[PDB]
Amino acid sequence: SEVEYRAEVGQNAYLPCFYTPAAPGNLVPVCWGKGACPVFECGNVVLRTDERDVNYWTSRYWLNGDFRKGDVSLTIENVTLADSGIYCCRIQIPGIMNDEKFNLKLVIK
Ligand SMILES: Cc1nc2c3cc(-c4ccc(NS(C)(=O)=O)cc4C)c(Cl)cc3[nH]c(=O)n2n1
Ligand SMILES: [Ca+2]
């Protein structure tokens, strides 16, 4: 079919997203949301970081990887069937018309 990420109800879901910081400690803000990246900034926002730290999160949504090294992969805890969908991870590279947009398809059964 096409790239997808899978989980059963009650498991954690794992959606990958990565960037390479220009130099260590120099982080780029990231936008995670539910819905494809053409929607608003990154869909219906679930989690955000800035140059310093996580600045916004929704219950059950986590960055448990080394986000200070560019691993901004998402964990969704205790998934239900309502969690299926496209998710947008947007790397907000400083500057205009240069963001990286990743659309991740999650299928729960
Ligand atoms: C009570 C609760 N807390 C969180 C939470 C917290 C975080 C978070 C916030 C700052 C940092 N930065 S730090 C201090 O340098 O490690 C690191 C993380 C992982 C995230 Cl991403 C997601 C979260 N999701 C969530 O459902 N809950 N619930
Ligand atoms: Ca940009």
UniProtKB/Swiss-Prot annotation:
Changing residue 80 to I: In SPTCL; uncertain significance. GO terms for cellular component: anchoring junction; cell surface; early endosome; immunological synapse; mediator complex; plasma membrane. Residues 1-103 form the Ig-like V-type domain. One of its GO terms (biological process) is negative regulation of immunological synapse formation. One of its GO terms (molecular function) is transmembrane signaling receptor activity. Disulfide bonds join 17-89, 31-42, 37-88. It is found in: Cell membrane; Cell junction. The keyword NADP does not apply. O-glycosylated with core 1 or possibly core 8 glycans. Phosphorylated on tyrosine residues; modestly increased after TCR/CD28 stimulation. Can be phosphorylated in the cytoplasmic domain by FYN. Expressed in T-helper type 1 (Th1) lymphocytes. Expressed on regulatory T (Treg) cells after TCR stimulation. Expressed in dendritic cells and natural killer (NK) cells. Expressed in epithelial tissues. Expression is increased on CD4+ and CD8+ T-cells in chronic hepatitis C virus (HCV) infection. In progressive HIV-1 infection, expression is up-regulated on HIV-1-specific CD8 T-cells. Residues 1-109 are extracellular. A 1,2-diacyl-sn-glycero-3-phospho-L-serine binds at residues 90, 97. Keywords: Adaptive immunity, Cell junction, Cell membrane, Disease variant, Disulfide bond, Glycoprotein, Immunity, Immunoglobulin domain, Inflammatory response, Innate immunity, Lipoprotein, Membrane, Metal-binding, Palmitate, Phosphoprotein, Signal, Transmembrane, Transmembrane helix, Ubl conjugation. Belongs to the immunoglobulin superfamily. TIM family. It is linked to May be involved in T-cell exhaustion associated with chronic viral infections such as with human immunodeficiency virus (HIV) and hepatitic C virus (HCV). This is Hepatitis A virus cellular receptor 2. It comes from Homo sapiens.
